[PDB]
Design an enzyme around this catalytic site. Structure first.
Site, PDB file in Angstrom:
ATOM      1  N   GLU A  31      12.128  -2.378  15.656  1.00 36.20           N
ATOM      2  CA  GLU A  31      12.835  -1.397  17.356  1.00 36.20           C
ATOM      3  C   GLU A  31      14.311  -1.716  16.177  1.00 36.20           C
ATOM      4  O   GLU A  31      14.683  -0.310  16.833  1.00 36.20           O
ATOM      5  CB  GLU A  31      13.087  -2.490  18.042  1.00 36.20           C
ATOM      6  CG  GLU A  31      12.234  -2.814  18.541  1.00 36.20           C
ATOM      7  CD  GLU A  31      12.539  -4.506  20.456  1.00 36.20           C
ATOM      8  OE1 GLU A  31      11.705  -4.074  20.838  1.00 36.20           O
ATOM      9  OE2 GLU A  31      12.833  -5.184  19.718  1.00 36.20           O
ATOM     10  N   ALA A  60      15.121   0.118  13.249  1.00 33.84           N
ATOM     11  CA  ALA A  60      14.224   1.265  12.664  1.00 33.84           C
ATOM     12  C   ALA A  60      14.635   2.131  13.838  1.00 33.84           C
ATOM     13  O   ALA A  60      15.184   3.632  13.632  1.00 33.84           O
ATOM     14  CB  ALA A  60      13.612   1.641  11.931  1.00 33.84           C
ATOM     15  N   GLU A  83      -0.078   3.656 -12.998  1.00 35.57           N
ATOM     16  CA  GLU A  83      -0.442   4.185 -11.868  1.00 35.57           C
ATOM     17  C   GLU A  83       0.569   5.173 -11.352  1.00 35.57           C
ATOM     18  O   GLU A  83       0.848   6.576 -11.165  1.00 35.57           O
ATOM     19  CB  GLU A  83      -0.935   3.651 -10.570  1.00 35.57           C
ATOM     20  CG  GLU A  83      -2.765   2.756 -11.039  1.00 35.57           C
ATOM     21  CD  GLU A  83      -3.397   2.328  -9.834  1.00 35.57           C
ATOM     22  OE1 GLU A  83      -2.396   1.687  -9.889  1.00 35.57           O
ATOM     23  OE2 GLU A  83      -4.238   2.679  -8.945  1.00 35.57           O
ATOM     24  N   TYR A 106      16.969   5.229  14.168  1.00 34.78           N
ATOM     25  CA  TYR A 106      16.867   6.863  14.110  1.00 34.78           C
ATOM     26  C   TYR A 106      17.496   7.323  15.548  1.00 34.78           C
ATOM     27  O   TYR A 106      18.134   8.660  15.401  1.00 34.78           O
ATOM     28  CB  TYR A 106      15.608   6.988  13.834  1.00 34.78           C
ATOM     29  CG  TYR A 106      14.678   6.573  12.972  1.00 34.78           C
ATOM     30  CD1 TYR A 106      16.026   6.647  11.150  1.00 34.78           C
ATOM     31  CD2 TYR A 106      14.017   5.540  12.498  1.00 34.78           C
ATOM     32  CE1 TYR A 106      15.033   6.310  10.214  1.00 34.78           C
ATOM     33  CE2 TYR A 106      13.693   5.236  10.960  1.00 34.78           C
ATOM     34  CZ  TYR A 106      14.436   5.411  10.177  1.00 34.78           C
ATOM     35  OH  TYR A 106      13.160   4.869   9.105  1.00 34.78           O
ATOM     36  N   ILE A 152      12.153   7.058   4.748  1.00 34.16           N
ATOM     37  CA  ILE A 152      13.519   5.858   3.628  1.00 34.16           C
ATOM     38  C   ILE A 152      13.739   4.627   3.672  1.00 34.16           C
ATOM     39  O   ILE A 152      12.913   3.775   4.251  1.00 34.16           O
ATOM     40  CB  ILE A 152      14.274   5.387   4.228  1.00 34.16           C
ATOM     41  CG1 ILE A 152      16.346   5.351   3.988  1.00 34.16           C
ATOM     42  CG2 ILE A 152      14.518   4.987   5.952  1.00 34.16           C
ATOM     43  CD1 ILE A 152      16.781   5.830   4.665  1.00 34.16           C
ATOM     44  N   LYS A 174      19.906   6.737  16.912  1.00 32.76           N
ATOM     45  CA  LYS A 174      21.757   6.088  16.058  1.00 32.76           C
ATOM     46  C   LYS A 174      21.700   7.887  15.572  1.00 32.76           C
ATOM     47  O   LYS A 174      23.194   8.526  16.539  1.00 32.76           O
ATOM     48  CB  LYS A 174      22.499   5.524  15.427  1.00 32.76           C
ATOM     49  CG  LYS A 174      23.216   5.476  15.600  1.00 32.76           C
ATOM     50  CD  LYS A 174      23.985   4.838  13.932  1.00 32.76           C
ATOM     51  CE  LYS A 174      25.355   4.536  13.809  1.00 32.76           C
ATOM     52  NZ  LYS A 174      26.057   4.372  12.621  1.00 32.76           N
ATOM     53  N   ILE A 187       4.243  17.062 -10.543  1.00 33.82           N
ATOM     54  CA  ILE A 187       5.619  17.267 -11.469  1.00 33.82           C
ATOM     55  C   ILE A 187       6.467  17.978 -10.712  1.00 33.82           C
ATOM     56  O   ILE A 187       7.503  18.666 -10.023  1.00 33.82           O
ATOM     57  CB  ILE A 187       5.682  16.646 -12.680  1.00 33.82           C
ATOM     58  CG1 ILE A 187       7.284  17.262 -13.159  1.00 33.82           C
ATOM     59  CG2 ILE A 187       4.543  18.442 -13.807  1.00 33.82           C
ATOM     60  CD1 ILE A 187       7.974  15.989 -12.745  1.00 33.82           C
ATOM     61  N   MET A 239       0.662  -1.368   0.113  1.00 32.23           N
ATOM     62  CA  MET A 239       0.117  -0.511  -0.118  1.00 32.23           C
ATOM     63  C   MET A 239       1.340   1.254  -0.346  1.00 32.23           C
ATOM     64  O   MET A 239       1.370   1.572   1.203  1.00 32.23           O
ATOM     65  CB  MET A 239      -1.166   0.020   1.091  1.00 32.23           C
ATOM     66  CG  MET A 239      -2.584   0.387   0.884  1.00 32.23           C
ATOM     67  SD  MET A 239      -3.079   0.053  -0.361  1.00 32.23           S
ATOM     68  CE  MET A 239      -2.808   0.549  -1.646  1.00 32.23           C
ATOM     69  N   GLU A 295       8.138  15.256   7.211  1.00 31.65           N
ATOM     70  CA  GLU A 295       8.463  14.144   7.477  1.00 31.65           C
ATOM     71  C   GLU A 295       8.771  13.218   6.542  1.00 31.65           C
ATOM     72  O   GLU A 295       9.171  13.360   5.281  1.00 31.65           O
ATOM     73  CB  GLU A 295       6.664  13.348   7.396  1.00 31.65           C
ATOM     74  CG  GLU A 295       6.950  12.593   7.933  1.00 31.65           C
ATOM     75  CD  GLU A 295       5.555  10.903   7.499  1.00 31.65           C
ATOM     76  OE1 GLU A 295       4.054  12.008   7.599  1.00 31.65           O
ATOM     77  OE2 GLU A 295       5.396  10.247   6.938  1.00 31.65           O
TER      78      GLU A 295
END
Lengths: 167, 167, 167, 167, 167, 167, 167, 167, 167, 167, 167, 167
Positions: free
Chosen positions: D124, D126, D38, D130, D83, D132, D47, D25, D80
């Site tokens: 955990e 990720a 799509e 982050y 990655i 770090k 664009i 999704m 926001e």
């Protein structure tokens, strides 16, 4: 193992070949089509339409069928299910596995409450596969489809989210 | 005497007033709408769409309700029926007469083979009026509508052309 | 008694006046607008966009405020809530009653699982209203909004479907 | 050494493959998409939309992942961050290095005041990456995402400009 | 064995050659055309028009002719029939077999009540073919077509659904 | 005396009233319409279409009916004729006089070779009117129209240019 | 007291009257215009353009002037400032108050870092008012404007956010 | 010898490669762009826009840089100048020669009265090359550009037509 | 034997080559054109225009000329005739045969009453060929064409349907 | 005295009234029209078309007729002339004066070399008025117009610039 | 005193009246027009075209004429001048005063180098006016305009910026 | 021998090269262009514009130059002439021969009354060529063109139809 992947425009030819051999009255976002370019125009027209989700059913990067979630209702959380499998792959039991994949997608990803399908009352195989995977008979629609010279009744079967999660 | 007439764009306001008081989730050619200008835009968009036919139900040039033939299928010759009557006119029995008018139009003008409708299983009045005018119960759809806090089942009832002509 | 009705285009003027006296940086379907014609063009552009539902909250055919359900996600079944009441009506408690109306619509009609809202941490009276009507504090967003010369924290509050149904 | 470069239309195929294996999704400028065409249509439509900036993170002219700055607010100066790294590259620490690249772009080029991200509380690793690179836990969002059959909480983490400049 | 398949855009060239050698005044959805690009533009314009259905009649993946159901009326359930066979195939009886194919499609799939066709009264061999396959003479149209220098009468022939089903 | 004048857009309302009281299934350039705005849109779409000519038949600046020349074929020089007279004027013989007006226009202005019309075989008074004004019976079309519950035959009648000029 | 409000399209006439009497070379989103309909077309074209923000300066619901923030750069956080006051209101000192209002909006709402303006070096009044409200001379542009027969230099003055907040 | 030629669309790739290596924030007719297709769309949009003139700087049919005349004002006869040279060609002194070419074009072809440019106050090389070719310092803009983590001042330099012609 | 076939778009090049060598002032549906792309645009614009019919004159699948029926009037049943033959095929008498083919098409297919043509009074050859095939001189137009330095008269010749059929 | 003035769109009604009473087959830039809205659409379509020039013929600000220069050829310098005068103004000799006005406009303003007109050979009045004002008979066109039941010949008359200037 | 103001669309009627009584062949941005709606469409089409500037010359809020600067060339800095004064105002010398106004605008605002105009050599009073206000005879154009039956020479007159500034 | 042929779109590249080496400020239908795609877009926009005619002057199927008839006025029957010859062909006298070709086209085909051209007064060799082929000096335009740093006078030369016909 058997897989689902999002239907791409480049796959439409395959889809057409399917709908050519099985029936003669085919629809795309509830609009009727006969020729390939008709199918392409409908695809382009409903490109971002979220009322239907379609998946190619693949076996080791080989296209063996099509799964369709149509009439998706995000308020009542229900969707109708339609499955088509290439007759060059009948016997491997791919129908039940693709139906199970679609059930998992609808209940676990789309957060649907109910799945339902409609089959001709002659196709007793379809009724048995769907009862196999857990569908319950919900109704019998009278003279619902004019099929090759006379009217046929249809069986509407359904299954619900919590029943699915506990199996 | 009670009459049907083709729904005009100038009547849409009345229609809105209807769909305001009865429910909160209304559709036009299966697209959802809330505000009046939304309804007008859908009307303009589906102006020549022949998949739905709508009639104003009139009593001596006075607008008392709405008849809708939706999901019209000209190959399988079937259509779904929906009726709404202004609550300022309940008791006169206009529901049954408007349903009879719509039955006559569908079977005698449109040459339909089957009419069907779907009602909430709570509305036992609707089931009795429709059984009164000749509908037979065809199925019970499970948790078909999320209604004000919980799911409701629905009764699908139907009636056929030759049965109608002989009464 | 206090009621909700669908926001009509003809109401936009009222809306503008609200967003003028209360704020200076207002949005419509997450696009910013200042002038009235900007608001009208944005309304026309997002006429059928179902990601937001807006209601006029009325007291005896008198326009008293605006309820907004925005960022509606029909897969994760959540929506953000925003409320505005004309300052000529403080004391009548219309904020809490309109918020309850919006809760009933979101949980009982839209079949949402979660409602959330964001308030400035300065406005302790909004936090008190929302705690009254059943919202729970969910988080504190750090320097989320640049307000009149410096950054402010915000309180994110939320409420869930079954907790609402049991109260 | 690891580098960022602007996302080109010709790269969309790679992007699709990413979002296919990692998720099912996926969104583009907050509009959902499944198929490649799509994604192409959404790209063409947005664009020049400056609310999102996307970069391919490359290692010696080899495409290794995608960095996304979304919901860019140039008034409240926040964005926001999202990655994605090809799973064929776990162990090289490319996630943290790409996140640092994105931090430098957002704080030193875009002149942003705050960066924030949302992770599933299950992952955990990720949260560890982050933490770090300097992110602080800011909040816990309750049942924010329906993930594979049930609702999950999420961790919202953030970082600010001057704290970044002093490290 | 002889078969029908939906007319594709890529087949139009073949169609043109047919209508070139057989006639000089040809129509597409009742609009006249002479050149190939005219035919292509008309095809594109009436792509989803359901008032006409066209089929290529094929013999072992070889294009042998064209079947046309035109003036389809889904209320009066009737359609006009037109058939063309490449003159390189006279003697194989393909006209009658293709006409039977078209009858089966119209009566068993389209649920039509009546099929009719119009032939020049000169061509007694077409009248003989159509009488063979079950058509009855219905009328004689006076000076209906200006053919190569003078007016010709035409024979209108027809066939009905139940008579077809009983043979 | 009775006269013809070109149909103006401002006259469409009158036309609608006619087609409402006389029939319920009306067409404009062979496209079906029910509501007034449908008729207006069809009129605007076919404004310069020369395949149909429509005249208001007037008696002393009073609108008394409608004459339609449809399916005009300028190569085979033929046209179908349709006539409607307000039922508030039966007895004045306006049908025959308007039909004569239309004959003069078609044969003397349009240079047509043949006029034809189709009537229900029930209406023997229309057959009598048309036989009076010089039409000859040409054929009997079997179950051509589904009329109010069952199929009806139709009489096709015609007239030719030189026979008209000699009378 | 003096007020700012968002510029409405209905105000454009007033704006034109301003730009008529003060100068002859006027611009809208950096495009030149002379006539009122030109101004209206530019307004409609740049309706959602966020590179410029314009305010009507009001004194007790009376239109007395115009404030313009142009060349808004949301990355470098700077904007150029232009002010025009009706000469029927000179002497009340409205220039300085409107400039102060615009300063507050730019620094406290838009979160700008720098405001700058450019005046003709003849207008020593403008230099003194702007020095009064806190602007510092930043540069002298040589022969920057061809004014009524010869070139004029201009004074560019500027002021910064933190300097503003501490006064 | 070094040459200028009009910028062709087919050259845009080269331009992109330039703006990739030197900076990260690039504009086209004052609209920002990141990707190549963005640049192409802006080029197509401003194809006949005469407010900017761009030249490829060539050395023996080899593309070595880009000259841009932007913010061209044909009433005040001034234009801003921007130059970019491929770093694979630094040292040959091409910057000064390309600047001289652009000066000749602006003063002798475009009949401009003033040329001006803006450089970062760190780039003391740019100030010396431009003083070399005859530019005079005109102003110092305070915190004009947010460059990689902090604000930078800029030097605005200018030169006039008659001064140029006499050297 | 000599043949006519409908003019295809792919033939336009040939047509241009014709109109290049014979004259310099050429028209398409009465609009003037000089270049090939002009001819293509006119062809595309008048693709379905039935006021002109054009044929390629072929000799054993070899393109030798062009026949044009222009100013076709379907009410007065007349058309103007124009013929052009490649000068690489003069002497074979193809002019008369192509004119005879066009006569047969106009009188026997199009049901025209009159054919007419206009020739320069210098071209005595054209007058003799046309008198040969049966045309009668109808008029002499005075100074009708400015031809290479001075005005020329023209001969208008004509022929009728019944005269043609009896030869 | 009698005057010409350019035909305005607001005059079209008058024009229609003319073309209503005189004939039934009217054209606008060679396209046929019957109704008023047809005439308006053609007028709007050919608004800048310089192939036809039309004038209202006025007598003391009273509209008495219409002059038309059609088929204007600016290379061969010729135009066809058509005149219509309201029958409520016959006898005043306005036809000849309006023709003289149009002659003066065509020869002295448009710099035309030749004027020509075509009249029915029955209208001997038209031939005498045109011979009166100086036209010479140029040709007799055979069966050129199908007029009310049979074909009519036409007289083509013409007059030249130098002949006109010397009278 | 006499003044200039920008030409508004609402003024076009006045303009038309001017160009009607003075001339019969009038242009707008070098496109010819006769009727009022033609002028309106041309105005709308060239709304932002900066190659022409038009002013109403007014005397005490009364419209007395039109000034036109056409063929404005901002590179060669020249423009052609055209002036029209209502003939109801001869004697007041408004031509020379309006021409002086236009000179001041062109030389002092537009920064033009040269103004030129073209007059018929018959009108010696215009040549006298223009010589009065400072124009010099520059050339004599031979047979430049076909005026009412024969060719006329024209006088081209001009004036330069510094000569104007010194007078 | 030297010849003219209509300018094709495929020739534009050649044209560009010409206008690049000879000039730097080139126009197409009086709109300025620099790059090749600009020229292509202008060509496409003015494809049917009859105010300009352009010819390639060819020597034995080799492109040697360009002839342009611009500002064609079909009422005053005049046109401006512009000629360009590839500098790789000086000495062959192609300028005069091409100019003679253009004279023959303008006077004998276009029926023009006057041809005129404008040359820089520096180029005495063009004045000599044009005097050779029969042009007469008509005027001297003062400071008409800003050429490479300063203003230049221009010579306007002309020629008339009958003088050409008598030589």
């Amino acid at each position: 193992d058997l897989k689902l992947r999002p239907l791409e425009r480049e796959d439409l030819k395959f889809v057409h070949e399917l709908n050519n051999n099985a029936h003669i009255m085919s629809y795309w976002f509830e609009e009727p089509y006969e020729a390939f370019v008709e199918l392409q125009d409908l695809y382009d027209k409903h490109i971002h339409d979220q009322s239907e989700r379609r998946f190619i059913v693949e076996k080791d990067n080989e296209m063996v069928g099509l799964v369709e979630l149509v009439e998706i209702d995000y308020i009542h959380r229900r969707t109708e299910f339609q499955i088509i499998i290439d007759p060059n792959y009948q016997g491997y039991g791919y129908a039940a596995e693709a139906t199970r994949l679609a059930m998992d997608y609808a209940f676990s990803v789309l957060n649907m409450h109910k799945i339902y399908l409609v089959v001709d009352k002659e196709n007793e195989k379809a009724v048995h596969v769907y009862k196999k995977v857990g569908f319950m008979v919900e109704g019998e629609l009278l003279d619902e489809f004019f099929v090759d010279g006379n009217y046929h009744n249809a069986i509407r079967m359904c299954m619900f989210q919590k029943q699915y999660f506990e199996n």
